[PDB]
Design a protein around this ligand. Structure first.
Ligand SMILES: NS(=O)(=O)c1c(F)c(NC2CCCCCCC2)c(S(=O)(=O)CCCO)c(N2CCCCC2)c1F
Ligand SMILES: NS(=O)(=O)c1c(F)c(NC2CCCCCCC2)c(S(=O)(=O)CCCO)c(N2CCCCC2)c1F
Ligand SMILES: [Zn+2]
Ligand SMILES: [Zn+2]
Lengths: 259, 259
């Protein structure tokens, strides 16, 4: 129904998905003129993130990105409701332009971005029900840049070889998802926004950590070159690249750090 | 169509199919998509010194302010002669005075001037040209906050007479080349589109490398003088943030400079 490229690309999402042309759209450029320090923004607590290595979690190529299913016993503590995990997934660019984060900082894209999606389990019974409702979603965003090899990210990336094509799936043994978060999680940007893909509902409480994580040049290249958005038997195969939405016009972004 | 709300830029494709098509402008000018082209030679600006005995219509059309230009103003150096039709501006707002259309290495400038031309070797007028490939050529000048600019003030001194949609004022001829920056020989060149509906992908863009300056007071005037609504409208709407977000570009921008 929708794509990141071509005639069904992001400027056309609003035809079928009205909220994509509505208010509170994400992602955004995090820059000085729209920030405000909020001393009340305390560190979140990440509970249940240490997933048992005896359990397995489904990784799927759905044609738009790769996503890992997460159990609802994982949750964020510190918001007005409990938010319980549902999935994590990534957004990236391409080897010729390896700058495919969704959020930018002072107009700069990072190489990639990880989103850990949660739903308000105090108010709603599941993520689908929560997704178009008040206070329904909370997403944690980790900016990713090129640097040292990252063994924790490789716990996902080592499986990309088995989800090359749309509709393919692989089981990933549990590991500590907190390993994917950066140093100093206390420093973050906080704002009310939306899903960054259709249906673009304006129901997401975003937390974008200030500090990026690093993955190696080779890990980033693998992420950018391993996957296809087409089924294996498609006579017109299409590489899965540039699967991020452009920044949206933006209204205040609160920061847990004063400078 | 508008730049904010239900008829804003993510909705333009609902009515204007080209706004969701290929070759859309503006774009972020950054290293990964740039290629030096030693063959790109300086444009020559012919007829830009408009007679002071003549006058040129300035119009608030509800989306920006535009100044009509005569077809005896020409650019030489492209594959055809292109003749002027108008100039106009794009800007931000006082709380976020960063409303250029093009960005450079992810940074918005305060505003941007467009001087629109059409291929007069092939087409009799800009309307005809606008639907034809490379029918149009636009010169873009990036504008930053700095010194007072007496040349731009030859346009800005009139803003208080075109405050509302449909209002018009005459501007005596002056040297339009005074609106251009230093070292016009240095520029970015790419094939793109109109940045407003109908978004036709028919524009040869030239973005000069170097910005010009206007003062904080001049920028504030440009950001606060104009309304998108008619004078008698019971709910006035300020004309601010009348720039399109940057578009995906994955394709090369050629530069006339290497360093
Ligand atoms: N970037 S984002 O964090 O906004 C965000 C989400 F949040 C959710 N998941 C949400 C919660 C679970 C499903 C219920 C409906 C809301 C989607 C999802 S999703 O898997 O559920 C797809 C449906 C929405 O397009 C995605 N995708 C986009 C397609 C590629 C994989 C990740 C997304 F990018
Ligand atoms: N940013 S841009 O340079 O792409 C660009 C153009 F080029 C043209 N003028 C072109 C040539 C003259 C008229 C023929 C049709 C194509 C528009 C125009 S225009 O006046 O002709 C309006 C066309 C609306 O469909 C505009 N506007 C947008 C609204 C505010 C004033 C300037 C524009 F922003
Ligand atoms: Zn996402
Ligand atoms: Zn313009």
């Amino acid at each position: 129904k929708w794509t990141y490229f071509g005639p069904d690309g992001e400027n056309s999402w609003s035809k079928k998905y009205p909220s994509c042309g509505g208010l509170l759209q994400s992602p955004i450029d995090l820059h000085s003129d729209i920030l405000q320090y909020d001393a009340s923004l305390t560190p979140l607590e990440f509970q249940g993130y240490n997933l048992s290595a005896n359990k397995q979690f489904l990784l799927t190529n759905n044609g738009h990105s790769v996503k890992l299913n997460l159990p609802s016993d994982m949750h964020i503590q510190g918001l007005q409701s409990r938010y319980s995990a549902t999935q994590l997934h990534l957004h990236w660019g391409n080897p010729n332009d390896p700058h495919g984060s969704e959020h930018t900082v002072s107009g700069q894209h990072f190489a990639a971005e990880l989103h850990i999606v949660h739903y308000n389990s105090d108010l709603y019974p599941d993520a689908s029900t929560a997704s178009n409702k008040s206070e329904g979603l909370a997403v944690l965003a980790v900016l990713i840049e090129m640097g040292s090899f990252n063994p924790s990210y490789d716990k996902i990336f080592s499986h990309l070889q088995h989800v090359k094509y749309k509709g393919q799936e692989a089981f990933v043994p549990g590991f500590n998802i907190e390993e994917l978060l950066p140093e100093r999680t206390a420093e973050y940007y906080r704002y009310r926004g939306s899903l960054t893909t259709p249906p673009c509902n304006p129901t997401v409480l975003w937390t974008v950590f200030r500090n990026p994580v690093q993955i190696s040049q080779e890990q980033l290249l693998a992420l950018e070159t391993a996957l296809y958005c087409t089924h294996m038997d498609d006579p017109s195969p299409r590489e899965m690249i540039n699967n991020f939405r452009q920044v949206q016009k933006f209204r205040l972004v609160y920061t847990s750090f004063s400078q």
